[PDB]
């Protein structure tokens, strides 16, 4: 805002209906210089009080079989011994 901030809270306005129909949150992604076909599909985690877990499911060709099946994972943040 000119000489103000967009972090300001000024309204208690209610939501409107109509518009385009909501999709399933599909997010097919561009590959990198790797050609690793991939697809993101976020979980509906929206209850945070400005802060929440942020898991999404992600398909990545060549990925192994995780709790989400072959080729898909959910990125739980971890630290591990390198087994490479």
């Amino acid at each position: 805002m000119q000489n103000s901030q967009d972090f300001s809270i000024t309204e208690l306005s209610l939501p409107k209906g109509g518009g385009a129909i909501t999709g399933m949150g599909e997010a097919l992604t561009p590959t990198g210089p790797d050609g690793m076909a991939a697809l993101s599909l976020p979980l509906p985690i929206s209850a945070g009080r400005g802060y929440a877990p942020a898991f999404t499911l992600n398909y990545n060709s060549g990925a192994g079989n995780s709790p989400f099946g072959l080729g898909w994972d959910c990125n739980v943040m971890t630290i591990r011994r390198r087994t490479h």
């Binding site: 399933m24 599909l41 509906p44 079989n65 072959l70 898909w72």
Partner: protein
């Protein structure tokens, strides 16, 4: 999920809510497919005329030399190598 026992993948995803009175409210499901495999239905044969005279009995070896990523036909002669 595609529970084929050998492997499984996520095939359908659907976003559903529920009304407080027990009704089901949904968006249509997201359909996924993975590549099929069935040697029973898809096995096919072709003569490898191109590999004529290749023979593992003698001094022939499959190897991806020079350019790599696909084996060529190496022949190790007495005091000399040849390669296709």
């Amino acid at each position: 999920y595609d529970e084929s026992a050998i492997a499984s993948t996520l095939v359908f995803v659907r976003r559903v809510g529920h009304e407080q009175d027990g009704n089901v409210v949904t968006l249509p499901p997201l359909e996924l497919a993975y590549q099929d495999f069935s040697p029973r239905h898809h096995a096919h044969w072709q003569p490898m005329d191109v590999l004529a005279n290749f023979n593992a009995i003698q001094r022939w070896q499959l190897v991806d030399l020079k350019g790599e990523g696909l084996p060529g036909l190496l022949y190790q002669d007495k005091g000399a190598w040849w390669y296709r």
